[PDB]
Design a protein around this ligand. Sequence first.
Ligand SMILES: Cc1cc(Nc2cc(NC(=O)c3c(Cl)cccc3Cl)ccn2)nc(N[C@@H](C)CO)n1
Length: 295
Amino acid sequence: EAPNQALLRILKETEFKKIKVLGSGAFGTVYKGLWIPEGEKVKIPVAIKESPKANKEILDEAYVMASVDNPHVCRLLGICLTSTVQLIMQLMPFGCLLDYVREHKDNIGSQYLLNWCVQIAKGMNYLEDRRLVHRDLAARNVLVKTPQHVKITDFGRAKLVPIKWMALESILHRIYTHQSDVWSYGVTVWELMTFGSKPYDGIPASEISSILEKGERLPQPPICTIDVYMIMVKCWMIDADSRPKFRELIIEFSKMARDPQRYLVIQGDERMHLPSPTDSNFDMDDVVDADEYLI
Ligand SMILES: Cc1cc(Nc2cc(NC(=O)c3c(Cl)cccc3Cl)ccn2)nc(N[C@@H](C)CO)n1
């Protein structure tokens, strides 16, 4: 296909300062930091992600992340070439959407939930245009820049095992398509609508494939109207080509986001509010968010 003319930016270790540790998982460590390029008078808040095999895996992710550019996808700002290479990306100050829905349940209204669905579908449809199959879309892999702006991340599995988020063809035949990402999208929506419930909780992964073959699906979340659950059910159909396209998901959730109380029934949804760029939210003097630092 077309040549990938994306720029791989190499950043000097001296150009950024690590503030604290955000977390540690089954990969390494995520740090919070500040990238202060050369003599540019800017401070960009960043996240820093840190044997030969380990470096191959991380450089494969750098490649995918450097090749995307969308408001609803996390892009690579650059890499740092230390003993083990570090991925430098935009700091998403509110962490992952999964923990966010769990921690802020009492202030999350229908407007926020339906807008997140549109934004996730937008990022996903962009990955589809760029011919990338995510293979790991889940609420844990959606980051929160602000409560009103979310982005898809974790390109470690992205191609040109999370059993409970996979399409039955993926579990059984290792078949991955944009239509199998649509299944993962349905599960992600379910995670949001339940305010972060674990899908098929208590059920071991070995039984999932068989549960799906019989025709069992995730239950209707209490806040979901038949209109919203119908969309989730459509994402979990056996015939992959029967599932909605992401471009249809943008349309469907957009219509709903225009009249959110008609599609999600939440007690107190209206008098609920989350941090906006009015006070608190944000030396703070020369800090510029990566979305405004264009080069
Ligand atoms: C308050 C806060 C902010 C933030 N921001 C952040 C996190 C990123 N995390 C990841 O990119 C990440 C994900 Cl979402 C999955 C697997 C590995 C990584 Cl490094 C990237 C950018 N900003 N992350 C966290 N906790 C991380 C451990 C979750 O990953 N907490």
